Symmetry: C4
Amino acid sequence: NDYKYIIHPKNRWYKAWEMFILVWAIYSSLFTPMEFGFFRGLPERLFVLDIVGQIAFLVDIVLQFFVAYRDTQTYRTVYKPTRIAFRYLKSHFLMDFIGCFPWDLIYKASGKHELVRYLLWIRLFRVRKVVEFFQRLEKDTRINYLFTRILKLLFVEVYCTHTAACIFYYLATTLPPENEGYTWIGSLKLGDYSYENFREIDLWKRYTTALYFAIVTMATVGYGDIHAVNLREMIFVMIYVSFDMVLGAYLIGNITALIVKGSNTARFRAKMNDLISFMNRKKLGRDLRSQITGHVRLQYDSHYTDTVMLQDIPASIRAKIAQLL
Amino acid sequence: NDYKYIIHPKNRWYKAWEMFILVWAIYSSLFTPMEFGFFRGLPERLFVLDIVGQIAFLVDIVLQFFVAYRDTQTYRTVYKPTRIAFRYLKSHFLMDFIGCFPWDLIYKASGKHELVRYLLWIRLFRVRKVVEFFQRLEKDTRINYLFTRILKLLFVEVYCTHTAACIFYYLATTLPPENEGYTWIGSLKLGDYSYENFREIDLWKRYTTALYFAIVTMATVGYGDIHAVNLREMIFVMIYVSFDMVLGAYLIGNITALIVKGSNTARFRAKMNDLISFMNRKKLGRDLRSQITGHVRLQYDSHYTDTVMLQDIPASIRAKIAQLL
Amino acid sequence: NDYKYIIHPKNRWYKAWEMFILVWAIYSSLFTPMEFGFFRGLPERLFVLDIVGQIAFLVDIVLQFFVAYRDTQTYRTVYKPTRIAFRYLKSHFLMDFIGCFPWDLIYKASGKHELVRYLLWIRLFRVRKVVEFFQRLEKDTRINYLFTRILKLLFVEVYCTHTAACIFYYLATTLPPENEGYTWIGSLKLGDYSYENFREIDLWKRYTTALYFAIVTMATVGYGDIHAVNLREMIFVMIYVSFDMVLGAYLIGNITALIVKGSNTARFRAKMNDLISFMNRKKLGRDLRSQITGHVRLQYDSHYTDTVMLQDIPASIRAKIAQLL
Amino acid sequence: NDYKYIIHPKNRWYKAWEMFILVWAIYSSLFTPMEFGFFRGLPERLFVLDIVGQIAFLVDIVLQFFVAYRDTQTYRTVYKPTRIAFRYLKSHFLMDFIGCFPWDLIYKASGKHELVRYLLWIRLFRVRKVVEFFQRLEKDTRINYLFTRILKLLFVEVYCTHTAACIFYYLATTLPPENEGYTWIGSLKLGDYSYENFREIDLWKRYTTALYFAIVTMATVGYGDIHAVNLREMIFVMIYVSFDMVLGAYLIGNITALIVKGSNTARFRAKMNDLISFMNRKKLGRDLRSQITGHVRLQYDSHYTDTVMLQDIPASIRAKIAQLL
Ligand SMILES: [K+]
Ligand SMILES: [K+]
Ligand SMILES: [K+]
Ligand SMILES: [K+]
């Protein structure tokens, strides 16, 4: 607590930086698969756009040597640079530094070898920012929990869908441009339009045609106007739909598990059903029918605070409600 | 209270009008996407229908200024007729007033501008009166609290495919009639029948083809004889099936939460399942291997009568059954 | 009772009759859509089969004034041959009586009017037997409940898509043979085999093609080799893929609800693994660990057999339990 | 005890053997449908592989007479090697010895009789070792037994589609090679590769094509470039997707119960959501929220998982903890 070259992690200049690299760790998570797939090296008018975005991430390298890490079991904020600067190199230092090398200038420098461009798939470790942003959005008791817990599983299931549409076009560009009729896009004809010589089509027609055959597959609709033709594309859509089957079952299971043990206000309307169904099975004279649901509304609005709340309560809370009521 | 200018909210001469406005709001929210998508301005018939579809809502928009409101906080009836007109002008006035302007004559008497027809979507706020019909049916006690959340959810799921079937046809008409072979309907050939010059086919063939696509996409069957061809129909199908993927898991999540607290055909087969871990684990007489299982057949729906709901609730009903026997 | 002109409801020679018309109730409710759709009047080789099948449902309509029942109030046997004839004649008499008429040649001996062959669709009220067989099986503890709850929903779901496969070919026979190219089967070509002049095709090829369509629609696969061509087949599959969309979300719901309320072994696994979960946060003794997991290895069965059903055993039944123990 | 012949069942040299035939019970389970579907007798290259794979199961069938079994009602490890003759010959002996003969050599030199090769399916009883591997992984308390039924039901859901992928190719070869255009592969054309004369394509192209069909059917995607054309392939696809529907519902039903049974951050929001409902009715201090919500992690798992899991435990460890303090 006596260092002062140390930011404790709720500053109004650090919370306004932590959300500044979340519109870069979203952009560099989306531009990275369609930088790998749709471009064999970036064009020259993106030279200014790709040198930034990596210039705002090595600012983040030096700036996380100075933030106060709150420990797990110690439950106190640690303030010494010796204790944060070693957990940084232990946990996340290679992930965020080897991705900050310019891999578009290296690829054009090395005689255009193809395998050096696979070292920009390590920029997909910047999805940590978005999943952490969704992670302490569950720990915010203001927003509907069923709204956020399904937005985390609808960020993942569409980001994986976006990535397995750039890989699916990359597997079409790996064949030469004379075995071009033996691929999923070079043999495509939609309406009165033919996708011949698909390296010259506009980027967004190629990207939309690729993403349509990942969202139609992800939703398990599968029209079959676009389908796999090669053998590597068959293997890729075997790997993809097998993982997407589990990813889709772990959304029904994640919605059901929040509806089943859902709102107790729905359970009150549920638990008056058997009351009415046994007062009206063997008919009782119509006397209390509204006063009972009013009294049980006032009861179950206080039944959780009758016994159930205050076995877990600490001292110096309940006496206030006890004196005020 | 001391007012005469207002109407009691449980009048059976007012709730015989809320059923009339219900079957007007059901009609003019199904026809409204059919007026948007399938017509560029209504024909010379359906004009008197277009004006009597709105002078049935003008009567309701002048009637709700004189209805009694039950307060949200104090749970009291608010009779005085300026705390309701201040309330009605704030919550529902301007999306119900601008849905009663004649947006077909305003379109045709303005030089036929296309963008003024997009104000025909504010008439889709009249599904308020259909979704509240399902909300005051849940708070009914006569039928299930969740079956009116299954018949409600199947209304919402099917209504969004009637709307998507009209937007999907509308996107085919935004292309010029000479480039019709690059659409989903202009390049269609189902059987020996070619769907060319598709603005001169009968209206019901066009609507049935579009609804056939939207419904076999909603159920995620997706045969593929009708698919997206443009880059705008690709984007629309990509938007639609993602929202449909979340709307189709909510149905399953509600049906599970209905079933998990059902009847004794799944509880009794846990009761005798736990009995047979004492009635067959510790060996028991075959004479008594009929007696208690016949008894636990005889208690549920007859002698059980949900005893805890007559245990925790006070004993005026017990005084009534003391008067019984 | 002193009547003796009534068969008792439980019997040796009567329960071997109800599982003899149970074979005729799974025959004559599976041959009935195949006789409506694929035939227009049975041929002469199938004459004696449609006569002997309807007299077995005629010696059974007279064998219901000779049987007792169990009313839900007295819950005893009600031997009186005039009470039963005013309950049988109310509920099950018309639907069980006019389905025994010889509808095959009543069609043939009335000038072959097609609308009189729609009155053999009420021979599908014979599936009362095949559903009371499955709702009798669920009150039987010889077999597990997870097998007789997912097979009642696999009888229903396969039977409805057997019916929707004969209706789907019937809608192709309602066009003339000069417009057979505008149907789903006359405009079919699977491989190098073309289904031209489909009335002159062997019955089982037509039935297998139609049922293969309806089964790959039921599972929501939907290949698209067989699709709806007309405007009346689109309407049928629009009804059908939206009915079985709820019928197949009701099956997932049952399989889920019969898993989340697991047996004793599942709760045993759960509570012992969450017992060992908090063990290695303190890391106590090794023989202590094994000894207390032995304590809760024998503290699952008789400890939680005993405490559960002692909440409900009636009087004079616990007494000989305590006497034997 | 006195017997020195037999292996003690928790040997260290019998846990490097049952993990040695678990890659021969995965090899001989994946290769046997590929030996049955894709060949007519093995080539003379693949000879010593078959012989080694069969001899390292003979060496196991004479090694399980030499072992003791844990009793399940007496719970003693039975060392007596005269009752190991029993519990093996009314157990897996004939389905370890009949499926151990050289069934390719019997087929190749007896006359090329096709029905002899159907006895290779006895070798699919060696999946019992792989399914008993997971059933010995359920009992490991150091891993969640609900996330050992998500890969157990995913091996089952992907082994049954590797097998179906070979039966689907086998039904294409039961037709003569001149009537190959009436198959699913002899009438296939993908891009510009016509799959004609399909017995001379190399093995991995045929296997990748058949597994591609079976896996996009298993996920219920179903593009429809590869569909059934025959009547045998139609009946097989009908049988396969009906099993697959129940298995896919069973996967969701098993995933759901994993999420319903507790989640700690979700349980923090299972309590905070109703705790604030009381607080906005009986309005406490707005500056007392920090006192309330801070202790909903302070005694979660520091008093919730500690003593509430311990009221079924004696205080012999509580004395150790109290002297620890
Ligand atoms: K499909
Ligand atoms: K398809
Ligand atoms: K599907
Ligand atoms: K599908």
